[PDB]
């Protein structure tokens, strides 16, 4: 997988691909990897799939309390601190490689976070295995302070270079645009590239074309009264 997060003047955009792998076998052709720490702090997860989801869920609960405890929008940096510490006690046994993006009232932020509790900041960050492929495109076309439309193009193309040179990345491109002082627009399936070509024949079989031994009915509604 590849995850880009591109910061711009009026917000930050977080984008990912939907191909989920378990080994060289592709588990899912579509699965969103965009998870929700908060409705304004979306992240996506790369690396070990099981370790990203559960840890974004655990601190998602804790940040929801924090958000209720302050009665305002949580900060992006609050999510980053909860994550950093939790990973740090394991000393990197749990491999979470997230780009954490979000808006809050002090402005736009974009961070990346690694499995040990290492943290970096920048105006574009890329993580996962297709990260290399995305980064090249980004550094040519990026200028300081993009618009929303500009940034959406840039992010979506960066994942696209992910698709032809990384095999962890594939299928559709999702974008979620978070802007300051507005709702977040999850533009799921912003680009669909590679759809399956039509099969030569339809594999349909009449009845009794596979063998059966014996059948029966088994009813699973409820224990039945008389």
């Amino acid at each position: 997988t590849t995850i880009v997060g591109v910061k711009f003047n009026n917000g930050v955009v977080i984008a990912a691909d939907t191909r989920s792998t378990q080994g060289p076998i592709v588990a899912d052709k579509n699965c969103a990897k965009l998870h929700r720490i908060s409705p304004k702090i979306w992240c996506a997860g790369a690396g070990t799939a099981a370790d990203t989801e559960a840890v974004t869920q655990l601190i998602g609960s804790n940040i929801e309390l924090h958000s209720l405890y302050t009665s305002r929008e949580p900060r992006v940096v609050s999510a980053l601190q909860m994550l950093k510490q939790h990973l740090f006690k394991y000393q990197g046994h749990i491999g979470a490689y997230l780009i954490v993006a979000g808006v809050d009232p002090t402005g736009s932020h974009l961070f990346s976070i690694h499995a040990h509790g290492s943290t970096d900041v920048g105006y574009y960050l890329s993580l996962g295995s297709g990260s290399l492929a995305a980064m090249a495109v980004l550094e040519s076309h990026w200028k300081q302070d993009l618009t929303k439309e500009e940034a959406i193009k840039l992010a979506s193309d960066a994942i696209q270079a992910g698709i032809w040179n990384d095999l962890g990345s594939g299928s559709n491109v999702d974008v979620c645009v978070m802007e300051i002082g507005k709702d977040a627009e999850y533009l799921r399936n912003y680009l669909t590239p590679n759809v399956r070509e039509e099969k030569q024949k339809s594999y349909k079989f009449p009845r009794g074309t596979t063998a059966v031994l014996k059948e029966s009915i088994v009813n699973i509604c409820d224990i039945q009264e008389e």
Binding site: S38, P39, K40, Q57, S61, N62, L65, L68
Partner: protein, 249 residues
Amino acid sequence: TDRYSFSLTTFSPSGKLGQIDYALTAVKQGVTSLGIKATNGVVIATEKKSSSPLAMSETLSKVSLLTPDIGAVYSGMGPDYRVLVDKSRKVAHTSYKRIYGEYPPTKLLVSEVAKIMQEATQSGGVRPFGVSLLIAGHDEFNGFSLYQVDPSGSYFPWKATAIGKGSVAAKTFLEKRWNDELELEDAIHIALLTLKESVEGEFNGDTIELAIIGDENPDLLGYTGIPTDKGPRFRKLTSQEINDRLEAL
């Protein structure tokens, strides 16, 4: 040492647990609060009062969010509600959003909070929170439901109810005003009217706190683009909005 591990609750000799009778007295020294369940929403209302006139009541909350579609409101002591609502939020997240990954049902949440009360009548160094809560909510499994949580640590579902020191007056008012089918708009007009007879302060929308768990709002959800996902059923009404409804009585 610290040998307080003996309960501070004890049976009384004519039956009944003395400590929770004492806490029930604390509910009738507190403010007034009510809930009317409509068939297309719930309205909950309470009165705001201040320790100083220099205290802001625009930063004073007595209606709190537990989960987005579920609100709470108290009568009794301020301090006792303040910690206990935090614990209500906490147990919704530890035991159903870390296990079932979603916001808990209204029925379910109300039961869990009664367990918290129940261990504050057990053991030393604790005593029950002297509040009754109304937990209005909507879930997708039992519909709208309106509950009353007791300092006993018991709950009951209701159709319309009141708590506070002016509860008896309020529920007798509501006796004639409740019907099988209600509009949310009519529910609001009854709610403010019932609370007019139980509030000795101003009756402006500044000092009357109003919140509905009416129809959901997907523009307060904080994101858009999953139609499938629904936003807060709760909506707190700010002071000007409450004034518009006072003229519409």
